[PDB]
Amino acid sequence: MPTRVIEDKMTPSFGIDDRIFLGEGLFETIRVNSSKPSFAYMHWERLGNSARQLGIPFEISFDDWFEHLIQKIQKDNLYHGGIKAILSGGPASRGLAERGQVSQLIFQTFNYSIQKHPVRLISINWLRDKANPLYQLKSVNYLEAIIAQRQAIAVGADDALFFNTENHVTETTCANLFLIENNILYTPRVEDGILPGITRARLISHCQQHKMSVQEISLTKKRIEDADAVFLTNSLQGIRRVLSLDNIIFEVNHPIIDKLIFLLNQDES
Amino acid sequence: MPTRVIEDKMTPSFGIDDRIFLGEGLFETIRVNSSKPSFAYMHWERLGNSARQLGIPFEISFDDWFEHLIQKIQKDNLYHGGIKAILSGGPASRGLAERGQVSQLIFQTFNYSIQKHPVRLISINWLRDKANPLYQLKSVNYLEAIIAQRQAIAVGADDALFFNTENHVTETTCANLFLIENNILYTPRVEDGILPGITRARLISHCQQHKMSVQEISLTKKRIEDADAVFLTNSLQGIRRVLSLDNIIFEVNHPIIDKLIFLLNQDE
């Protein structure tokens, strides 16, 4: 059977012959609320879609996936917190284009605090090609993000914002970006070369259900600078308000943001 | 001691809290010939330079490094083959900008096969910014290269050639590139966003020593399309001849290539 969960016997890890050491690995970071994994299906779907694209087996049913998440939450006594799933290409013979016959999955829980202070961003100087497939995969290849976040921290900021080679905004090191102008929501298109976030997707669905105008379009730096508000989304933090980008301070409050926080919070899927 | 070697106790690995699983890892691939590692110093120097750039501790002296290599060669009965050194950021608390207090170093030996057939390359469609620091580091973040290599194999090619956002050649998935035009050697500049190869640097040195004109300059796709010959360099395979890039076919012979193979082989 071509996908193996590595269980505790005490924390599991990947062996040195695993292709995850060449970067052949994917992850999902799942919020746990009241001992229940939030949006377990959407995380499974995305992980499987990405695995398929990379040729990595992902032969674990949704029910078994969900059961594994529950057994981890129960064993580690988690109520609120997170679970990270890491899928490796697996042990394989040496060679860049070799193929792991059996992929390996590890689950790990953690506890963390939701940060409520608004975030300070800096723009990164190097650009991404929207055609580079790496940027639509939640992979283990995060050094770029690490370097960018360290630069942000070095200059007094919290996180870094990337742009593509058409000078359009994509995302930060860990979150999708939204802005609000004249009570209309804007966010970069999937085609701008972003990670298609689950939280982003949920927020768009909520807006559609509530007939709140939301536009998926290519956004220049000037659009951000001129926004009424700017905020970020991800599964662990939900919506995070943005105080500034480079030398531009924003108002952090908006009724649309409070409404969206409420709606994301009520979701028990 | 902020750098720990993980020894056999048999095979060692990194723990799940290690920042290597976020991509914070560097490597060196060292050729071994008749039980002797090749250019151990240049490999140590590069890894140290990169670790310093990333803030990963690398408190291992060259003598210590060399001793580790020889001990591993001996223990594994390695005569001809390779040694891969992997340096991880190490265990750390959760967070993307957290820092490993103690980096971890693991050495592994392997046999490998020498491939001498002239290679067929394809050009990759997505471009890299030369200002993206990733591309000058020999890191564990090789998924881009994996995807590219798989595309090359799908159409019966051997390797894939990357370009930067100024439409200049950089490197392949595993090797630097050189071209010959009118008996002059040309190779992309380090500033074009390439890994500064050891084999590349050795070749530049041999050319200088033998009065061979060698130009480190930005190269367009057209320059390569018009080249007399094209070849690749890395530690394990040495000089590799190039038969084709996309639909463009090259003569694989050139007197300069023969001379350079001779000169690099004394060293190996």
Side-chain angles (χ1 to χ4, degrees), chain A residues 1-8 11-210 212-267, chain B residues 1-8 11-267:
Chain A
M1 208 268 293
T3 304
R4 174 164 177 262
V5 176
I6 308 168
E7 316 264 35
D8 308 31
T11 333
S13 199
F14 301 107
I16 198 59
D17 62 344
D18 198 304
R19 296 179 46 79
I20 193 163
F21 294 104
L22 308 179
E24 197 176 72
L26 297 163
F27 75 97
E28 285 291 339
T29 177
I30 302 153
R31 185 163 173 173
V32 174
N33 305 294
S34 312
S35 309
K36 290 162 171 139
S38 179
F39 305 89
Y41 173 76
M42 293 176 81
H43 287 289
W44 177 83
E45 175 183 40
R46 181 167 66 188
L47 179 52
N49 287 343
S50 296
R52 190 156 25 260
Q53 187 187 313
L54 294 182
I56 304 172
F58 191 60
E59 291 291 338
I60 179 169
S61 69
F62 173 68
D63 289 340
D64 286 352
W65 162 264
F66 189 90
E67 167 59 356
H68 276 106
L69 301 172
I70 295 300
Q71 286 311 125
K72 260 275 152 166
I73 290 154
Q74 286 181 0
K75 186 206 282 166
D76 297 355
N77 302 295
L78 212 62
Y79 188 90
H80 300 326
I83 293 173
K84 190 173 169 171
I86 305 175
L87 180 71
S88 69
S93 284
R94 192 186 132 74
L96 197 64
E98 293 296 315
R99 186 88 75 182
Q101 317 226 255
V102 181
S103 56
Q104 315 279 307
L105 190 48
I106 292 177
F107 302 91
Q108 287 291 114
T109 65
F110 54 94
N111 284 86
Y112 71 97
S113 291
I114 289 166
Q115 294 128 39
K116 40 204 205 308
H117 62 118
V119 295
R120 292 197 177 272
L121 301 180
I122 52 123
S123 294
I124 289 289
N125 64 306
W126 70 83
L127 307 178
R128 296 170 171 181
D129 196 332
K130 73 184 190 201
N132 184 336
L134 259 288
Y135 298 121
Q136 303 184 48
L137 298 168
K138 205 162 192 58
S139 80
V140 297
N141 299 247
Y142 267 48
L143 189 51
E144 187 185 326
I146 292 167
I147 295 172
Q149 181 150 50
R150 293 197 200 295
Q151 288 192 3
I153 286 165
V155 302
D158 301 305
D159 197 357
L161 187 66
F162 305 93
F163 293 77
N164 67 25
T165 59
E166 297 168 352
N167 303 115
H168 296 138
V169 186
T170 62
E171 61 195 356
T172 73
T173 67
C174 68
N176 291 115
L177 185 143
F178 281 82
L179 58 86
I180 295 173
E181 180 181 60
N182 308 326
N183 297 330
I184 299 157
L185 282 144
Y186 298 87
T187 197
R189 297 180 312 142
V190 184
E191 299 105 319
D192 296 326
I194 60 169
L195 203 286
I198 289 163
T199 312
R200 170 190 185 282
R202 289 167 56 207
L203 191 157
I204 293 166
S205 288
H206 282 300
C207 288
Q208 284 163 352
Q209 290 165 242
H210 290 261
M212 298 162 69
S213 185
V214 54
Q215 304 306 120
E216 297 176 69
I217 65 172
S218 295
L219 292 160
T220 59
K221 188 175 183 204
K222 183 176 162 44
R223 294 299 307 270
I224 305 165
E225 293 170 341
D226 292 351
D228 294 327
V230 179
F231 70 84
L232 309 173
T233 64
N234 67 23
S235 287
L236 297 176
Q237 290 290 329
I239 287 174
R240 185 91 189 261
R241 297 166 193 269
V242 174
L243 177 57
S244 62
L245 174 60
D246 303 315
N247 68 304
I248 302 137
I249 311 294
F250 304 107
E251 173 55 60
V252 297
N253 293 315
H254 201 287
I256 291 182
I257 298 175
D258 300 311
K259 182 161 190 183
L260 294 176
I261 288 170
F262 176 92
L263 293 171
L264 295 171
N265 277 355
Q266 83 168 148
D267 303 337
Chain B
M1 227 295 209
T3 313
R4 177 193 175 217
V5 176
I6 315 171
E7 318 266 13
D8 302 27
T11 280
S13 199
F14 299 102
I16 200 53
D17 55 352
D18 196 308
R19 294 175 56 76
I20 197 159
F21 298 116
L22 304 173
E24 198 177 74
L26 298 166
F27 79 96
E28 285 293 331
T29 298
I30 306 151
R31 176 161 176 176
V32 174
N33 304 116
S34 306
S35 308
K36 297 166 159 170
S38 189
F39 306 100
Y41 186 90
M42 289 169 85
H43 288 284
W44 174 81
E45 173 179 61
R46 183 164 71 185
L47 180 52
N49 288 344
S50 296
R52 272 191 293 286
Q53 189 181 315
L54 295 178
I56 302 168
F58 191 67
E59 288 298 317
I60 186 165
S61 62
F62 171 68
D63 285 347
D64 201 4
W65 164 262
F66 194 82
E67 171 74 5
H68 277 103
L69 297 181
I70 293 301
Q71 292 293 111
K72 196 62 179 165
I73 286 161
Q74 273 179 215
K75 197 192 202 207
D76 297 353
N77 283 287
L78 191 67
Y79 191 78
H80 294 309
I83 293 180
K84 186 169 171 174
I86 298 170
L87 178 67
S88 68
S93 60
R94 197 190 48 89
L96 205 59
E98 295 295 317
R99 188 91 60 173
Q101 292 182 39
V102 177
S103 63
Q104 315 280 305
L105 180 57
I106 295 187
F107 298 92
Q108 292 288 103
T109 63
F110 58 91
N111 296 315
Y112 75 94
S113 55
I114 291 177
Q115 278 98 32
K116 292 175 62 176
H117 74 267
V119 297
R120 297 193 178 281
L121 301 179
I122 60 152
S123 294
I124 290 292
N125 70 301
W126 70 87
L127 302 182
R128 299 168 167 183
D129 195 329
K130 72 178 181 187
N132 184 334
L134 197 64
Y135 301 115
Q136 295 181 57
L137 300 168
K138 204 164 187 63
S139 77
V140 295
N141 298 251
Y142 270 43
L143 190 51
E144 211 182 302
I146 292 165
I147 294 169
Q149 168 80 322
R150 285 198 199 300
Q151 291 188 355
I153 290 148
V155 294
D158 299 284
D159 198 353
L161 183 61
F162 293 103
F163 290 77
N164 74 21
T165 57
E166 292 178 1
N167 308 119
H168 296 144
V169 191
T170 63
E171 68 199 351
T172 71
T173 67
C174 70
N176 292 112
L177 184 143
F178 284 77
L179 66 81
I180 298 167
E181 172 199 83
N182 298 342
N183 289 306
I184 297 161
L185 285 138
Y186 297 86
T187 199
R189 298 188 301 183
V190 189
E191 299 112 329
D192 296 328
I194 58 177
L195 195 149
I198 291 168
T199 312
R200 172 192 184 281
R202 290 165 54 208
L203 184 162
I204 292 168
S205 294
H206 281 299
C207 286
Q208 280 154 9
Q209 292 164 216
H210 290 271
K211 308 197 189 288
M212 277 190 286
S213 188
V214 58
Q215 308 306 122
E216 303 174 60
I217 63 164
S218 294
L219 299 164
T220 61
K221 194 166 180 193
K222 178 180 173 47
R223 285 303 293 271
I224 189 172
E225 284 180 353
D226 293 347
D228 301 331
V230 178
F231 66 84
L232 310 179
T233 65
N234 58 22
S235 295
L236 297 182
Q237 301 296 334
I239 289 165
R240 188 81 179 270
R241 295 173 196 265
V242 171
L243 178 54
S244 64
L245 176 63
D246 306 313
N247 61 311
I248 301 300
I249 312 306
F250 306 105
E251 169 62 59
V252 302
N253 286 310
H254 197 290
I256 290 177
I257 296 167
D258 293 321
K259 180 164 205 175
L260 291 176
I261 287 165
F262 174 74
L263 296 169
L264 282 181
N265 270 346
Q266 304 155 324
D267 297 345

